[PDB]
Design an enzyme around this catalytic site. Structure first.
Site, PDB file in Angstrom:
ATOM      1  N   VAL A 183       5.316  -4.638   6.721  1.00  0.00           N
ATOM      2  CA  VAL A 183       6.332  -4.006   7.582  1.00  0.00           C
ATOM      3  C   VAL A 183       5.796  -3.605   8.964  1.00  0.00           C
ATOM      4  CG1 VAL A 183       8.252  -3.333   6.035  1.00  0.00           C
ATOM      5  CG2 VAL A 183       6.140  -1.952   6.074  1.00  0.00           C
ATOM      6  N   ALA A 225       2.413  -0.974  12.409  1.00  0.00           N
ATOM      7  CA  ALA A 225       2.428   0.343  13.073  1.00  0.00           C
ATOM      8  C   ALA A 225       1.937   1.538  12.238  1.00  0.00           C
ATOM      9  CB  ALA A 225       3.822   0.630  13.647  1.00  0.00           C
ATOM     10  N   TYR A 226       2.402   1.638  10.992  1.00  0.00           N
ATOM     11  CA  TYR A 226       2.074   2.782  10.111  1.00  0.00           C
ATOM     12  C   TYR A 226       0.725   2.646   9.375  1.00  0.00           C
ATOM     13  CZ  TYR A 226       7.023   3.763  11.080  1.00  0.00           C
ATOM     14  OH  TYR A 226       8.226   3.998  11.714  1.00  0.00           O
ATOM     15  N   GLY A 227      -0.031   1.604   9.725  1.00  0.00           N
ATOM     16  CA  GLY A 227      -1.303   1.276   9.072  1.00  0.00           C
ATOM     17  C   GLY A 227      -1.232  -0.126   8.486  1.00  0.00           C
ATOM     18  N   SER A 228      -1.814  -0.305   7.298  1.00  0.00           N
ATOM     19  CA  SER A 228      -1.704  -1.584   6.584  1.00  0.00           C
ATOM     20  C   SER A 228      -0.715  -1.386   5.431  1.00  0.00           C
ATOM     21  CB  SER A 228      -3.066  -2.084   6.100  1.00  0.00           C
ATOM     22  OG  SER A 228      -2.995  -3.477   5.816  1.00  0.00           O
ATOM     23  N   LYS A 246       0.658   1.255   1.029  1.00  0.00           N
ATOM     24  CA  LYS A 246      -0.348   1.257   2.074  1.00  0.00           C
ATOM     25  C   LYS A 246      -1.734   1.106   1.439  1.00  0.00           C
ATOM     26  CE  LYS A 246      -1.123   4.459   5.670  1.00  0.00           C
ATOM     27  NZ  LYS A 246      -1.842   5.728   6.012  1.00  0.00           N
ATOM     28  N   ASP A 264       3.734  10.408   8.153  1.00  0.00           N
ATOM     29  CA  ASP A 264       2.580  10.312   9.030  1.00  0.00           C
ATOM     30  C   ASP A 264       2.185  11.626   9.632  1.00  0.00           C
ATOM     31  OD1 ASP A 264       2.247   7.589   8.585  1.00  0.00           O
ATOM     32  OD2 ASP A 264       3.311   6.993  10.403  1.00  0.00           O
TER      33      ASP A 264
HETATM   34  C1  LIG Z   1      -0.658  11.562   5.112  1.00  0.00           C
HETATM   35  C2  LIG Z   1       0.509  10.636   5.336  1.00  0.00           C
HETATM   36  N1  LIG Z   1       1.571  10.737   6.140  1.00  0.00           N
HETATM   37  N2  LIG Z   1       2.249   9.551   5.843  1.00  0.00           N
HETATM   38  C3  LIG Z   1       1.526   8.886   4.907  1.00  0.00           C
HETATM   39  C4  LIG Z   1       1.880   7.652   4.351  1.00  0.00           C
HETATM   40  C5  LIG Z   1       1.112   7.019   3.374  1.00  0.00           C
HETATM   41  C6  LIG Z   1       1.525   5.795   2.863  1.00  0.00           C
HETATM   42  C7  LIG Z   1       2.708   5.195   3.304  1.00  0.00           C
HETATM   43  C8  LIG Z   1       3.103   3.880   2.703  1.00  0.00           C
HETATM   44  C9  LIG Z   1       3.480   5.820   4.284  1.00  0.00           C
HETATM   45  C10 LIG Z   1       4.694   5.356   4.793  1.00  0.00           C
HETATM   46  C11 LIG Z   1       4.849   4.942   6.125  1.00  0.00           C
HETATM   47  C12 LIG Z   1       6.104   4.527   6.575  1.00  0.00           C
HETATM   48  C13 LIG Z   1       7.213   4.521   5.714  1.00  0.00           C
HETATM   49  C14 LIG Z   1       8.602   4.116   6.184  1.00  0.00           C
HETATM   50  O1  LIG Z   1       9.576   4.266   5.431  1.00  0.00           O
HETATM   51  N3  LIG Z   1       8.775   3.682   7.443  1.00  0.00           N
HETATM   52  C15 LIG Z   1      10.115   3.340   7.897  1.00  0.00           C
HETATM   53  C16 LIG Z   1      10.042   2.422   9.095  1.00  0.00           C
HETATM   54  C17 LIG Z   1       9.930   0.989   8.593  1.00  0.00           C
HETATM   55  C18 LIG Z   1      11.265   1.524   9.104  1.00  0.00           C
HETATM   56  C19 LIG Z   1       7.045   4.967   4.405  1.00  0.00           C
HETATM   57  C20 LIG Z   1       5.803   5.388   3.963  1.00  0.00           C
HETATM   58  C21 LIG Z   1       3.055   7.052   4.779  1.00  0.00           C
HETATM   59  O2  LIG Z   1       0.509   9.580   4.641  1.00  0.00           O
END
Ligand SMILES: Cc1nnc(-c2ccc(C)c(-c3ccc(C(=O)NCC4CC4)cc3)c2)o1
EC number: 2.7.11.24
Length: 345
Positions: A27, A29-32, A48, A163
């Site tokens: 998906v 930006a938010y990492g891997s 992730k 995040d």
């Molecule tokens: C600490 C911390 N803060 N956030 C996290 C974290 C850890 C793992 C994951 C998979 C995620 C995560 C990141 C993003 C989403 C997410 O739903 N993003 C929506 C955008 C794509 C439309 C859901 C979860 C967030 O960890």
């Protein structure tokens, strides 16, 4: 009992996940991160895979921090942990960490950017942010990086905070969303900061949901500070004294004093109650900002506010922050946290 893992290559790295997770797709930006269909719960999930979790002391400590944070967060409006796994069969071979959370279809950045938001949408969206922040802050955790892109939302406008800030100089430079929601005290390292920095971020977000425009789209830190002070006025003697940075204090005193603007003349046509709440959030002095707990009881949220369904958090022990440990020690602590994870009901 251990599940069977299978493997696939998803852009340059090998994902090894349990069979319950199917249809993986990236998906960024938010990492891997991958979207996945979790066959045991019937949920769409985000998986992730951590990036080289124990390659340095700082990395190993970060990984442990992240897992600790996520394991503690159990609130409807805060992202939490559905699952955590490693294909490793013992500590010796433990070298990858995978995290599973809900996958909400969109972020708030795409909402404000693509749809018109009624005042009622604003009520509900901000309500939910404040409700989750009361929980977050009650655990003595500060998000630090609240912006529309880390507010996940579903079709029904239900919101989770994501995040937690846990950035380099370049990423904060120029005309960038990475800095537009940052309280002036953090942006410019005025003083030792606290959890109300998160309230300033909410102010900027709320403003932008009402008007559809970034509140303080500075071209750089100074330009942004000017944008901020034009609205809220320059600091009074009381605040100047609380800025512990001599150098920052000296700079801010070189500015032509300006008064706080009329918020009804900036947010033209908005709910007077929305305006009031904004005035209480966008206060320069952090000591004087409205807290999330106080905000939830504000008239603006009369419709959603339910004092019996705004829970606080269990105590969060973050004494580990004080600790200096070896990679191996941070890694063993992380392992203990992986091994003892119990899924939610
Ligand atoms: C600490 C911390 N803060 N956030 C996290 C974290 C850890 C793992 C994951 C998979 C995620 C995560 C990141 C993003 C989403 C997410 O739903 N993003 C929506 C955008 C794509 C439309 C859901 C979860 C967030 O960890």
């Amino acid at each position: 009992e251990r599940p069977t893992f299978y493997r696939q290559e998803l852009n340059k790295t090998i994902w090894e996940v349990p069979e319950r997770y199917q249809n993986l797709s990236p998906v960024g930006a938010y990492g891997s991160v991958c979207a996945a269909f979790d066959t045991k719960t019937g949920l769409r999930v985000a998986v992730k895979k951590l990036s080289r979790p124990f390659q340095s002391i700082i990395h190993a400590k970060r990984t442990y921090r992240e897992l600790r944070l996520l394991k503690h967060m159990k609130h409807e409006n805060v992202i939490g942990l559905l699952d955590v796994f490693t294909p490793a069969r013992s500590l010796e071979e433990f070298n990858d960490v995978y995290l599973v959370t809900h996958l909400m279809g969109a972020d708030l950045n795409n909402i404000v950017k693509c749809q018109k938001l009624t005042d009622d949408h604003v009520q509900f969206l901000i309500y939910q942010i404040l409700r989750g922040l009361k929980y977050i802050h009650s655990a003595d955790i500060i998000h630090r990086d609240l912006k529309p892109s880390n507010l996940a939302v579903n079709e029904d406008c239900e919101l989770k905070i994501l995040d937690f800030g846990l950035h380099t100089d370049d990423e904060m430079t120029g005309y960038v969303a990475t800095r537009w929601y940052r309280a002036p005290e953090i942006m410019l390292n005025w003083m030792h900061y606290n959890q109300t920095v998160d309230i300033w971020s909410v102010g900027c977000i709320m403003a932008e949901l009402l008007t559809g425009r970034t509140l303080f789209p500075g071209t750089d830190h100074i330009d942004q500070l000017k944008l901020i002070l034009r609205l809220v006025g320059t600091p009074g003697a009381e605040l100047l004294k609380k800025i512990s940075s001599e150098s920052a204090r000296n700079y801010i005193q070189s500015l032509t004093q300006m008064p706080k603007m009329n918020f009804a003349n900036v947010f033209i046509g908005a709910n007077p109650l929305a305006v009031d709440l904004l005035e209480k959030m966008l206060v320069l002095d952090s000591d004087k900002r409205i807290t999330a707990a106080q905000a939830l009881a504000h008239a603006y949220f009369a419709q959603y506010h339910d004092p019996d369904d705004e829970p606080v958090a269990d105590p969060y022990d973050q004494s580990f922050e004080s600790r200096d440990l070896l990679i191996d020690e941070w890694k063993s602590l992380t392992y203990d946290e992986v091994i003892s994870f119990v899924p939610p009901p």
